[PDB]
Design a protein around this motif. Structure first.
Motif, mmCIF file in Angstrom:
data_model
loop_
_atom_site.group_PDB
_atom_site.id
_atom_site.type_symbol
_atom_site.label_atom_id
_atom_site.label_comp_id
_atom_site.label_asym_id
_atom_site.label_seq_id
_atom_site.Cartn_x
_atom_site.Cartn_y
_atom_site.Cartn_z
ATOM 1 N N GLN A 70 0.839 -1.185 0.000
ATOM 2 C CA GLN A 70 0.000 0.000 0.000
ATOM 3 C C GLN A 70 0.877 1.240 0.000
ATOM 4 O O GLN A 70 2.088 1.172 0.209
ATOM 5 C CB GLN A 70 -0.936 0.023 1.213
ATOM 6 C CG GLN A 70 -1.542 -1.313 1.559
ATOM 7 C CD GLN A 70 -2.702 -1.180 2.515
ATOM 8 O OE1 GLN A 70 -2.754 -0.251 3.315
ATOM 9 N NE2 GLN A 70 -3.644 -2.105 2.436
ATOM 10 N N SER A 71 0.258 2.370 -0.228
ATOM 11 C CA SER A 71 1.025 3.603 -0.189
ATOM 12 C C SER A 71 0.782 4.315 1.127
ATOM 13 O O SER A 71 -0.369 4.395 1.575
ATOM 14 C CB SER A 71 0.640 4.513 -1.349
ATOM 15 O OG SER A 71 -0.726 4.869 -1.288
ATOM 16 N N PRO A 72 1.819 4.833 1.777
ATOM 17 C CA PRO A 72 1.620 5.481 3.076
ATOM 18 C C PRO A 72 0.587 6.591 2.985
ATOM 19 O O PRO A 72 0.589 7.389 2.048
ATOM 20 C CB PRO A 72 3.011 6.028 3.414
ATOM 21 C CG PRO A 72 3.767 6.000 2.135
ATOM 22 C CD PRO A 72 3.229 4.857 1.364
ATOM 23 N N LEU A 73 -0.308 6.635 3.969
ATOM 24 C CA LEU A 73 -1.244 7.744 4.058
ATOM 25 C C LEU A 73 -0.578 9.007 4.577
ATOM 26 O O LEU A 73 -1.102 10.105 4.363
ATOM 27 C CB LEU A 73 -2.423 7.371 4.955
ATOM 28 C CG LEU A 73 -3.360 6.306 4.391
ATOM 29 C CD1 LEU A 73 -4.026 5.532 5.507
ATOM 30 C CD2 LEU A 73 -4.394 6.935 3.485
ATOM 31 N N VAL A 74 0.558 8.873 5.252
ATOM 32 C CA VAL A 74 1.363 9.994 5.712
ATOM 33 C C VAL A 74 2.751 9.811 5.124
ATOM 34 O O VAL A 74 3.450 8.852 5.469
ATOM 35 C CB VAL A 74 1.425 10.067 7.246
ATOM 36 C CG1 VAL A 74 2.422 11.109 7.687
ATOM 37 C CG2 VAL A 74 0.063 10.376 7.804
ATOM 38 N N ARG A 75 3.147 10.716 4.233
ATOM 39 C CA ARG A 75 4.405 10.559 3.518
ATOM 40 C C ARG A 75 4.907 11.928 3.105
ATOM 41 O O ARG A 75 4.099 12.822 2.837
ATOM 42 C CB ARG A 75 4.227 9.668 2.284
ATOM 43 C CG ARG A 75 3.361 10.295 1.216
ATOM 44 C CD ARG A 75 2.418 9.288 0.605
ATOM 45 N NE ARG A 75 1.858 9.784 -0.642
ATOM 46 C CZ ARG A 75 1.318 9.009 -1.573
ATOM 47 N NH1 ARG A 75 1.260 7.699 -1.398
ATOM 48 N NH2 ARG A 75 0.834 9.549 -2.682
ATOM 49 N N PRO A 76 6.218 12.124 3.035
ATOM 50 C CA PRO A 76 6.749 13.402 2.555
ATOM 51 C C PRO A 76 6.380 13.639 1.101
ATOM 52 O O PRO A 76 6.170 12.710 0.321
ATOM 53 C CB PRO A 76 8.263 13.245 2.725
ATOM 54 C CG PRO A 76 8.426 12.138 3.701
ATOM 55 C CD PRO A 76 7.290 11.209 3.452
ATOM 56 N N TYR A 95 8.299 11.903 -1.720
ATOM 57 C CA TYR A 95 7.816 10.586 -2.104
ATOM 58 C C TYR A 95 6.954 10.645 -3.355
ATOM 59 O O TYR A 95 6.874 9.658 -4.090
ATOM 60 C CB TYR A 95 7.037 9.983 -0.935
ATOM 61 C CG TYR A 95 6.613 8.545 -1.098
ATOM 62 C CD1 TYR A 95 5.405 8.223 -1.695
ATOM 63 C CD2 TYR A 95 7.404 7.512 -0.628
ATOM 64 C CE1 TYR A 95 5.006 6.918 -1.832
ATOM 65 C CE2 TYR A 95 7.012 6.204 -0.762
ATOM 66 C CZ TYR A 95 5.812 5.913 -1.362
ATOM 67 O OH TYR A 95 5.417 4.605 -1.500
ATOM 68 N N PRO A 120 5.793 0.109 -4.237
ATOM 69 C CA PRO A 120 5.500 0.284 -2.809
ATOM 70 C C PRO A 120 6.342 -0.611 -1.869
ATOM 71 O O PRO A 120 6.846 -1.567 -2.350
ATOM 72 C CB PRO A 120 3.979 0.218 -2.838
ATOM 73 C CG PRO A 120 3.585 0.308 -4.272
ATOM 74 C CD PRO A 120 4.675 -0.475 -4.947
ATOM 75 N N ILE A 121 6.412 -0.377 -0.543
ATOM 76 C CA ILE A 121 7.418 -1.040 0.277
ATOM 77 C C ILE A 121 6.817 -1.648 1.539
ATOM 78 O O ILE A 121 7.434 -2.511 2.173
ATOM 79 C CB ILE A 121 8.544 -0.051 0.627
ATOM 80 C CG1 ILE A 121 9.758 -0.783 1.182
ATOM 81 C CG2 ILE A 121 8.060 0.970 1.630
ATOM 82 C CD1 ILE A 121 10.978 0.090 1.265
ATOM 83 N N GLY A 122 5.617 -1.217 1.916
ATOM 84 C CA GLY A 122 5.020 -1.716 3.139
ATOM 85 C C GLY A 122 3.509 -1.664 3.158
ATOM 86 O O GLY A 122 2.881 -1.508 2.110
ATOM 87 N N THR A 123 2.912 -1.799 4.341
ATOM 88 C CA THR A 123 1.464 -1.759 4.487
ATOM 89 C C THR A 123 1.078 -0.909 5.687
ATOM 90 O O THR A 123 1.816 -0.821 6.668
ATOM 91 C CB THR A 123 0.863 -3.158 4.661
ATOM 92 O OG1 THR A 123 1.345 -3.740 5.877
ATOM 93 C CG2 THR A 123 1.244 -4.054 3.499
ATOM 94 N N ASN A 124 -0.096 -0.294 5.602
ATOM 95 C CA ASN A 124 -0.651 0.456 6.718
ATOM 96 C C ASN A 124 -1.290 -0.502 7.710
ATOM 97 O O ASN A 124 -2.037 -1.403 7.317
ATOM 98 C CB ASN A 124 -1.688 1.456 6.221
ATOM 99 C CG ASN A 124 -1.069 2.643 5.534
ATOM 100 O OD1 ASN A 124 -0.406 3.462 6.163
ATOM 101 N ND2 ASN A 124 -1.279 2.743 4.233
ATOM 102 N N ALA A 125 -1.002 -0.314 8.992
ATOM 103 C CA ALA A 125 -1.530 -1.166 10.042
ATOM 104 C C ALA A 125 -2.090 -0.314 11.171
ATOM 105 O O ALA A 125 -1.609 0.790 11.440
ATOM 106 C CB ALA A 125 -0.452 -2.110 10.579
#
Ligand code: 2TM
Ligand code: MG
Ligand code: ZN
Ligand code: ZN
Ligand code: ZN
Lengths: 1473, 63, 244, 76, 63
Positions: free
Chosen positions: E24-30, E33, E42-47
């Motif tokens: 997923q794409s971070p909901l909070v990101r610079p 990005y 993409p690199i991770g997931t929101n949890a």
DNA sequence: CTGTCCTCTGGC
DNA sequence: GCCAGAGACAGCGAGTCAGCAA
RNA sequence: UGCUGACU
């Protein structure tokens, strides 16, 4: 059925060269060793008579295959003799000092015979005979010395076995080293004056005798053969019956082929580096064998013979030491590199073997398995197998295991037969495993290799193993479906495990005799206390501390059902009823207290027969943390009588106190430490487990712990003050820097920037650090002002209800420096103890003007992590955080080596059965371990202030441990009478430094004599007129046997531990313990009188209790305390102002033992008299160094006629604190500088191609260059000189010379002292103390002021200077105090019993010896001393001396496969028949 | 001739696409030298204030 | 790991009915102990939780660019206002129930949405168990790798920490009976290990240096010690050992 | 006759280990075991009953030794 | 990090290649990005993370 | 990069 | 024979996993 | 064996 035969001794000598023959299966001649396809070529290096290299073939020498054949040795026979590379250097000396004509050594026969006799006596151990022989000689040759030497060797034989001890090896080492070093230089020959046929060796493989011929190993061999004949009687002792032939090689030995394994290298599939060196030797042998045939079929031919010789010799060198020859290539590493290095063969495959039956996996937190258990994830359990022997009482459960099979868990992978072996069950047909489940019990019984069975013992290790607690034994709790090894969190601090990817090893003992030791010794509950200082190691961590501190707080009430289900969930009890309590509140609603939950959990865990404990202590949470609202004053109330700060457990029931980290934690004297003392280590582990479970259930069921943002937030109306203080802090740079440069107080705003720039581009750079420091102080004042505004009460939520506080404040995690730096300030950045460095232009960062005064430009961060930090502050913070990591890496790199060296020297020191700490060879290091015995972990409660605990819990302590049995099986009369005698003596002699003596006691007639008797005489023989009357009256005019002034003047009885064997003698304790016991008995019999409680203990039962508890804390025989001292000095360092600090100082002290230390110092107190205080001002001004350069304005040099005018400074600003006068200063130039000037002028010109009158005249009387100087009748107005060298000299700016010389030219200074200073106050108790510290070291140059300063109480950090002015027993204590003060700067505290042993070992043999590579030369173990460093030099030594090894060290015992001679192996078992 | 270089190893390295943030950092890496990995003194590891805007303070291997 | 250096292993997979459910019906899927904050001071995770919860609530996408939020305009103020504008509470704490006892915990918990990365290091790639297997043929010890079966190295630090326990037989087991253990036999009189030699087939080892066969006796000795004696002979040095 | 009367922990460990290695090699158990399959538990049961006919031979640093009985040794 | 390393499988023939199934794409990101589109990979997931001490198995860096 | 050796060398 | 000139010379934490090229 | 990454 093992060989049964053991090794007693290993000696290293040299092989004859004629017995190596018959140690050889065949001579190898074919160079090409690799066959066309990769097989062994016949007669090559890899051959089939030198053994099968691989399992494919069978040896020709003995028919037998690989894995069963011991390999065989072969020999490349050389065309002509070559020198052996190890015995080569000695050969050179044996040829340097000698007459090639006479064939005799050029040494005076006195030295030869003296050393011969000294060696003859050393061979048997006689050690006084050495100096006795030397003095017999000097007072006087062979007949004079041989009589005494034979008398010694005869009367002192039976000591050839007791000669392999330190102090007998050091002497021989020193003697032979001094011989080789001082008496083997080239000398004109005694008998023929012209016998210097100077052998002078070029690079190895080259010796050249002059009339510049080349020494052929055959001519050198004949020279040695004819020199041995004349000087053999002497050299057979300097080398062991060494034959000179051993110095030369006529063949090279090819090792067995099994030890030379073909691997691969670039573009070569089958090659060993050792065979590539031996192949080069074989190839040169073949070329040389051709030239010899060419001579036979017969200057270039023989120049070629002498060149191929030198090449072959560098080929035989490389075969022995890759780097002996530096001009050859294709050189693979020799044997010196196969043996001697960290890769090596000793530090790998010898001390660090690889092990079977071991696992390694990531570790995971468990917490629901007991503290003594490890969770095994069913994948190791099904592979790790223990070999259980089959017997009548196990054949049933073993039968189920063989039936379950290799893959079901309670199973088995194999069963070993009585005579055969290894019938594997791994089949999965399930029927043959049943076919073999029978025939179990159908000689040595079948052994079933069973799996791990949920009760097994496993050794667990984390790899940076820095202490004993890093390896502990655990109890194999098997867990299904995982690949991780689960471990309790109480065992974390012991390993330093952190559950962030933390692989750990698990070893599975396989002997049933290592299981007994894993159970008894290595168990993980005997490891509760760290051996460094005896303080607890296991404890609960993190949310078991915030849980227990919030449940044990005063306002926690639980209903019957939360009380229960919280008791049973901590207990999970398995046997017997749960003993509950009564509600504290019974009426409005029955309710409990939370302290009652812990109470009722405490009375169930403590063993049924034993009785609950009493305990009084303090909590970690200060009683001030709870003060919300200003405190008011009640007249009769001591607020601390009833506070949550005092923990009061009364019969196992917590009555008061919070029980934070101070208990349950790694802090000493808490609840779990006392549980471990009174009831043992298993009960403390049980308490830890149950308390962890209880505090988890509490947070998981009824409460919760979190850390949001409303507990790091700060109140408004408190951030306004923070903001105003930060605004004020932006104006404190100019004043700081200015008042640190001592500039005009004001009116300069640009002179300050220029002065800062000058100080920055300066060479010394110590007027720059002054500014840095006096700027950091201002910034720190401001930073401290800001923390007080916000952190204590400016937080939105306070400590009982704040989650960050109550986490740093109960010891859970973090410190008060973290809570701040998250709120209200980040601080002043400091990189190397200084502010961030400036650029080359004077700006610290591209954003800041050059030389900017604001503290912000120097790394003062006023931002917090709550509201982030700006880019410039981010930069400095990153600089700091990065230097931290760099320093971590480097520090660990140095600490590892320090600890390795220490551990490699103090490893063989074990406590013996006579309580004496002896080394491997029997050398007594200490006569009592800690100077009293008493290993560290057991002496924790023998301190005073812990007796009121032993007294309160007396009934439990006697029942649980000593019992009434030991108290009444004790007989204290011998020791009690000794202490009565000591007490009487000390009663008759209050001042024990008053020069007791019989005759001195017969000076009470002093008045009787001085009255009238002796009034008429002179100093007859220097004594006195009145002393002779006393001598006459005493001498023979007194009673024959009743002149007993002796008894009134006799020595104090010697301490009890010295005479009365503290172990088997009751009441024989240390002189400092019995004093404490007396003091406490007197302060305890005067408390029972006013106690309103009944005490059923009597002072004389408490005394016996304490005496038994002492006698039992007595350092079991076999303890191996030197390894514990090593590890205790190592671990704290490995982990962690004008003197040195850190590992540099530890390495100066221990590893180097230097006479030159970077910061030498002294400290003599000042005598406390009015005259002394006045004289000291002059003393300080007297010892500081005044140098010509410190008193000079500027020189004026004119130039071949070179004039020089010095122009000295006015006295206004240098006579104040230097004690100098102008006549002395100028006289100095005339007599020392103006002649050192000509000394330096010659230094250059040797390799270049009424009253004014007498002073000038004497000065030019002595030198021929000067003409006339000057005079200055008015304060050194103009004082020049003139020189001239008229013919030809290098006229350059010689000012360079006369300036490089006018700096190292010092008027006058005490040797070694660079400056003094009186640090006014050093004490609060007796604040009146003054100390005259110094920054140099000269002990005797202070002895002249025994009336101004106290010369007792003199101290220095040198330890070599103390050892030379006061002795070695006085340097021991300086060593100990230095190590202690080095550790103290970091809060670390190693127990004194370890530093005592380290200092006693270092100063063992009379000198301060370093604990390093040169300290092991005086060591009686060749197998040790080569497992440390320079293994090839220590092997060459041990080989040319025939040095014998007794296999008594741990290293020599692990090299030859023996059992170490300490700890569990120190005795036999001797089954009786 | 060593090419006026001072280093004879680690000149080219494997570019591994474990992620696109491992890959993109191989074309922005700058190695002070491979010989400095063997040094007692640590002064080529100081993050001086002259690498402001040219080298990242945070992005450095941490061992 | 998170995007703030908070790496940690996965220790449990907590059942979904034992997790503390919130008053909104939700149930976390990551549980993070609150004790990694006090010493590591990663206050950016506590802001990312609130920013991500506000994003998921409002359908927005906030930026976490460094240096965009000052002391005057704080990040916590901004995101707490965002949360309070969605019906949640300023400080980002919602109060949970205990999924095991069913009671509302006394403390209100800090919950939010954070971005987790999964690291490439797995226990499946770093786990080893060896019983018996291959051996270095020069020293006859375990091979020393994981792709090959391979043994774990005991080490000199471990050898020096294990004989501080006084356990000489655990050391004997580890270093001798597990790594290398042979029965090299010696001539008792000559005291030499190289001298005994087998014969051609009554197979009697006979000493080569002195022709006797009544003097040969077997000794239990490591294998690297026999390698050491051989490589010393290579240098003409002799190791004479006293058998008892 | 001059060494300590008690049994050091190293001696207890080695005596338990040796008695266990003997029991495991089919030696008669003089302790009336009660259903336990561990030889070390049996060895502890025997040590508690004072039935172990072993002779601890304590060696002094000069070769001299003293032979103590496992029965005549105060086990703590 | 185990992420989405590339789009062309069937073609690379690397040695190891770690792939995350549903990034997923971070909901909070610079905002940077979004300049270098890093959501192509993409690199991770929101949890949903709760900061609570509840289990006894999440202590000392464990989750 | 440090501190002792430690073996010359060299000058005196 | 007295002690600088050096100029070699030796030491430099523990464990673990891979890939790739020779 | 080597060398380049990486883990505590
Ligand atoms: N090269 C290395 C690096 C690490 N180690 C070992 O790993 C531990 C944890 O490293 P670490 O770096 O995590 C320190 P820690 O205090 O746990 O970190 P924190 O402040 O984030 O909690 C160290 O204390 C050493 O025992 C080693 O032997 N060699
Ligand atoms: Mg870690
Ligand atoms: Zn053979
Ligand atoms: Zn001569
Ligand atoms: Zn023989």
């Amino acid at each position: 059925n093992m060989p049964w035969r053991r090794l007693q001794g290993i000696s290293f000598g040299m092989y004859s060269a004629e017995e190596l023959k018959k140690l050889s299966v065949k001579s190898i001649t074919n160079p090409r060793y690799l066959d066309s396809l990769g097989n062994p070529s016949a007669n090559g290096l890899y051959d089939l008579a030198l053994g099968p290299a691989d399992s494919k073939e069978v040896c020709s020498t003995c028919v037998q295959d690989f894995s069963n054949c011991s390999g065989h040795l072969g020999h490349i026979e050389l065309p002509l003799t070559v020198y052996n590379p190890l015995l080569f250097d000695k050969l050179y000396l044996l040829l340097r000092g000698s007459c090639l004509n006479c064939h005799m050594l050029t040494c005076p026969r006195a030295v030869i015979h003296l050393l011969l006799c000294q060696l003859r006596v050393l061979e048997v151990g006689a050690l006084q005979a050495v100096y006795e022989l030397e003095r017999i000689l000097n007072r006087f040759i062979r007949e004079e010395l041989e009589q005494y030497t034979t008398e010694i060797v005869q009367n002192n034989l039976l000591g050839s076995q007791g000669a392999h001890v330190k102090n007998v090896c050091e002497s021989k080492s020193k003697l032979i080293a001094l011989f080789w070093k001082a008496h083997m230089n080239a000398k004109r020959c005694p008998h023929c004056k012209t016998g210097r046929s100077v052998v002078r060796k070029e690079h190895n493989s080259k010796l050249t005798i002059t009339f510049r011929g080349y020494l052929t190993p055959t001519s050198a061999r004949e020279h040695l053969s004819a020199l041995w004949k004349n000087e053999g009687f002497f050299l057979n002792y300097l080398f062991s019956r060494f034959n000179p032939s051993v110095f030369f090689l006529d063949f090279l030995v090819v090792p067995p082929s099994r030890y030379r394994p073909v691997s691969r290298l670039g573009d070569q599939m089958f090659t060993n580096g050792q065979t590539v060196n031996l192949q080069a030797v074989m190839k040169d042998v073949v070329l040389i064998r051709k030239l010899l045939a060419l001579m036979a079929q017969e200057q270039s031919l023989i120049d070629k013979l002498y060149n191929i010789w030198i090449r072959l010799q560098s080929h035989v060198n490389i075969v022995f030491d890759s780097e002996m020859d530096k001009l050859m290539m294709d050189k693979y590493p020799g044997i010196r590199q196969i043996l001697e290095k960290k890769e090596g063969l000793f530090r790998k495959h010898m001390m660090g073997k690889r092990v079977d039956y071991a696992a390694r996996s990531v570790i995971c937190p468990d917490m629901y398995i007991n503290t003594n258990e490890i969770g095994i994830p069913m994948v190791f359990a099904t592979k790790l197998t223990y070999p259980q022997p089959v017997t009548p009482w196990n054949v049933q459960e073993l039968r189920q295991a063989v039936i379950n099979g290799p893959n079901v868990h309670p199973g088995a992978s194999m069963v070993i037969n009585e005579d055969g072996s290894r019938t594997a069950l791994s089949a999965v047909d399930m029927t043959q495993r049943e076919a073999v489940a029978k025939q179990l019990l159908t000689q040595g019984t079948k052994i079933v290799c069973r799996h791990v069975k949920n009760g097994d013992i496993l050794l667990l290790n984390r790899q940076p193993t820095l202490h004993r607690p890093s390896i502990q034994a655990h109890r194999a709790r098997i867990l299904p479906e995982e690949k991780v090894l689960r471990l309790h969190y109480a065992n974390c601090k012991a390993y330093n495990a952190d559950f962030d990817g933390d692989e750990m090893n698990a070893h599975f003992p396989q002997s049933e005799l290592g299981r007994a030791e894993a159970y008894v010794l290595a168990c993980t509950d005997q490891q509760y206390l760290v051996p460094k200082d005896g303080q607890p190691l296991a404890g609960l961590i993190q949310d078991h501390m915030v849980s227990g501190a919030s449940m044990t707080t005063r306002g926690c009430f639980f209903t019957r059902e939360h009380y229960m289900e919280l008791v049973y969930r901590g207990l999970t009890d398995k046997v017997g009823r749960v003993k509950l309590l009564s509600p504290s509140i019974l009426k409005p609603f029955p309710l409990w207290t939370g302290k009652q939950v812990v109470s009722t959990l405490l009375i169930n865990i403590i063993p049924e027969d034993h009785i609950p404990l009493n305990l009084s202590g303090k909590a970690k949470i200060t009683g001030k943390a709870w003060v919300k609202e200003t405190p008011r004053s009640v007249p009769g109330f001591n607020p601390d009588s009833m506070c949550e700060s005092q923990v009061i457990i009364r019969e196992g029931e917590l009555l008061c106190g919070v029980l934070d980290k101070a208990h349950y934690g790694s802090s000493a004297y808490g609840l779990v430490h006392c549980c471990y003392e009174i009831y043992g280590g298993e009960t403390s582990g049980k308490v830890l487990t149950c308390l962890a479970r209880l505090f988890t259930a509490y947070l998981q069921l009824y409460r919760g712990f979190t850390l949001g943002v409303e507990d790091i937030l700060v109140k408004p109306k408190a951030d306004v003050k923070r903001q105003r203080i930060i605004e004020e802090s932006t104006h404190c740079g100019p004043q700081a820097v200015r008042a640190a440069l001592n500039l005009p107080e004001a009116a300069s705003y640009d002179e300050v920037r220029g002065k800062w720039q000058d100080a920055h581009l300066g060479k010394d750079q110590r007027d720059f650090n002054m500014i840095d420091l006096k700027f950091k102080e201002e910034v720190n004042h401001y930073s401290n002002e800001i923390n007080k505004a916000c952190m204590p009460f400016g937080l939105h939520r306070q400590f009982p209800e704040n989650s960050l506080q109550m986490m740093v404040q109960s010891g859970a995690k973090g410190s008060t420096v973290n809570t701040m730096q998250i709120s209200c300030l980040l601080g002043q950045i400091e990189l190397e103890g200084r502010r961030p460095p400036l650029m080359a232009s004077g700006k610290s960062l591209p954003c800041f003007e050059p030389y900017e005064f604001t503290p912000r430009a120097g790394g003062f961060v006023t931002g917090r992590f709550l509201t982030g930090i700006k880019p410039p502050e981010f930069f400095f913070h990153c600089m700091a955080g990065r230097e931290g990591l760099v320093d971590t890496a480097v520090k660990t790199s140095r600490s590892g080596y320090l600890q390795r060296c220490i551990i490699k020297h103090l490893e063989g020191l074990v406590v013996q059965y006579d309580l004496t700490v002896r080394d491997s060879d029997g050398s007594v290091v200490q006569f009592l371990y800690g100077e009293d015995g008493l290993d560290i972990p057991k002496t924790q409660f023998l301190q005073p202030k812990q007796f009121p605990f032993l007294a309160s819990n007396y009934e439990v302590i006697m029942k649980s441990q000593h019992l009434h049995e030991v108290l009444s099986r004790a007989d204290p009369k011998k020791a009690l009478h000794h202490f009565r005698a000591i007490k009487k003596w000390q009663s008759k002699h209050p001042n024990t430094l008053l020069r007791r003596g019989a005759f001195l006691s017969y000076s009470q007639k002093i008045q009787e004599a001085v009255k009238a008797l002796k009034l008429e005489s002179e100093n007859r023989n220097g004594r006195s007129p009145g002393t002779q009357e006393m001598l006459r009256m005493w001498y023979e005019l007194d009673e024959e046997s009743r002149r007993k002034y002796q008894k009134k003047a006799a020595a104090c009885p010697d301490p009890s531990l010295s005479v009365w064997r503290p172990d088997i003698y009751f009441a024989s304790v240390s002189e400092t313990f019995e004093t404490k016991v007396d003091d406490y008995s007197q302060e305890w019999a005067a408390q029972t009188e006013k106690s309103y409680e009944k005490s059923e203990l009597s002072l004389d039962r408490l005394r016996t209790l304490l005496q038994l508890k002492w006698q039992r804390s007595l350092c079991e025989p076999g303890e191996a305390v030197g390894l514990l001292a090593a590890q205790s000095i190592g671990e704290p360092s490995t982990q962690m102002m004008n003197v040195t600090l850190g590992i540099p100082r530890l390495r100066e002290i221990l590893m180097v033992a230097s006479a030159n230390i970077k910061t030498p110092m002294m400290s003599v107190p000042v005598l406390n008299t009015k005259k002394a205080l006045k004289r000291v001002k002059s003393l300080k001004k007297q010892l500081t160094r005044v140098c010509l350069g410190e008193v000079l304005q500027k020189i004026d040099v004119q130039e071949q006629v070179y004039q020089l005018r010095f122009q000295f400074l006015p006295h206004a600003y240098y006579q104040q604190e230097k004690c100098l006068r102008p006549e002395d200063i100028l006289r100095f130039m005339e007599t020392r500088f103006f002649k050192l000037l000509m000394e330096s002028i010659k230094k250059k010109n040797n390799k270049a191609s009424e009253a004014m009158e007498r002073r000038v005249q004497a000065v030019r009387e002595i030198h021929p260059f000067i003409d006339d100087y000057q005079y200055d009748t008015e304060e050194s107005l103009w004082c020049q000189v003139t020189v001239k060298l008229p013919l030809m000299k290098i006229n350059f700016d010689m000012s360079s010379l006369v300036v490089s010389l006018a700096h190292g030219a010092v008027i006058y200074a005490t040797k070694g002292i660079t400056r003094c200073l009186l640090n006014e106050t050093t004490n609060n108790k007796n604040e009146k103390e003054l100390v005259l510290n110094t920054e140099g070291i000269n002990l005797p140059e202070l002895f002249k002021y025994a009336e101004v300063l106290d010369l007792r109480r003199l101290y220095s950090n040198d330890i070599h200077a103390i050892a030379n002015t006061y002795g070695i027993e006085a340097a021991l204590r300086v060593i100990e105090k230095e190590i202690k003060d080095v550790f103290a700067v970091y809060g670390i505290a190693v127990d004194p019993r370890h530093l005592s042993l380290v200092a006693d070992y270092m100063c063992f043999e009379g000198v301060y010896k370093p604990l390093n590579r040169f300290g092991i030369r005086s060591n009686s173990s060749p197998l040790q001393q080569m497992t440390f460093e320079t293994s090839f030099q220590f092997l060459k030594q041990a080989t040319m001396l025939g040095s014998h090894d007794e296999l008594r060290s741990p290293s020599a015992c692990l090299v030859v496969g023996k059992v170490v001679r300490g700890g569990t192996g120190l005795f036999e078992l001797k089954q009786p028949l | 001739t060593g090419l006026g270089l001072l280093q004879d190893s680690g000149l080219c390295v494997v570019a591994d696409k474990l992620n696109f943030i491992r890959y993109l950092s191989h074309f922005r890496c700058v190695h002070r030298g491979a010989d400095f990995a063997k040094m007692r003194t640590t002064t080529v590891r100081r993050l001086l204030p002259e690498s402001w805007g040219f080298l990242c303070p945070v992005h450095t291997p941490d061992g | 790991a998170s995007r703030h250096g908070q790496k940690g292993i996965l220790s449990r997979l907590w059942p979904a009915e034992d997790m503390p459910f919130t008053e909104s019906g939700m149930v976390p899927d990551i549980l993070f102990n609150p004790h990694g904050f006090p010493s590591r001071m990663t206050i950016g995770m506590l802001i990312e939780s609130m920013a991500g919860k506000s994003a998921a609530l409002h359908g927005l996408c906030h930026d976490a660019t460094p240096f965009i939020f000052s002391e005057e305009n704080s990040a916590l103020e901004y995101f707490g206002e965002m949360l309070k504008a969605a019906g949640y509470n300023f400080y980002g704490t919602e109060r949970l129930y205990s999924g095991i006892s069913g009671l509302e915990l006394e403390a209100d918990i800090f919950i939010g949405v954070v971005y987790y990365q999964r690291l490439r290091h797995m226990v499946s790639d770093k786990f080893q168990v060896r019983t018996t297997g291959a051996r270095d043929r020069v020293t006859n010890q375990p091979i020393g790798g994981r792709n090959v079966q391979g043994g774990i190295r005991f080490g000199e630090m471990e050898r020096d920490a294990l004989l501080a326990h006084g356990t000489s037989f655990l050391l004997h087991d580890r270093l001798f009976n597990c790594s290398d253990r042979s029965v090299a036999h010696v001539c008792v009189k000559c005291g030499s290990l190289l001298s005994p030699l087998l014969e051609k087939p009554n197979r009697k080892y006979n000493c080569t240096l002195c022709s006797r066969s009544d003097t040969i006796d077997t000794v239990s000795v490591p294998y690297v010690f026999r390698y050491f004696v051989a490589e010393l002979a290579a240098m003409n040095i002799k190791v004479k050992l006293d058998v008892v | 006759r001059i060494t300590t009367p008690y049994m050091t922990k190293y001696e207890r460990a080695r005596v338990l280990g040796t008695r266990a290695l003997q029991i495991a090699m089919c030696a008669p158990v003089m302790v009336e075991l009660e259903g336990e399959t561990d030889p070390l538990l049996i060895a502890m049961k025997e040590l508690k009953a004072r039935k172990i006919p072993i002779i601890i031979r304590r060696y002094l640093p000069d070769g001299s030794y003293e032979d103590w009985g496992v029965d005549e040794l105060i086990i703590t | 990090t185990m992420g989405f390393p590339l789009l062309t499988y069937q073609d690379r023939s690397d040695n190891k290649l770690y792939r995350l199934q549903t990034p997923q794409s971070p909901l909070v990101r610079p905002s940077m990005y979004d300049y270098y589109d890093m959501d192509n990979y993409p690199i991770g997931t929101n949890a949903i993370v709760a900061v609570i001490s509840y289990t006894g198995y999440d202590m000392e860096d464990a989750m």
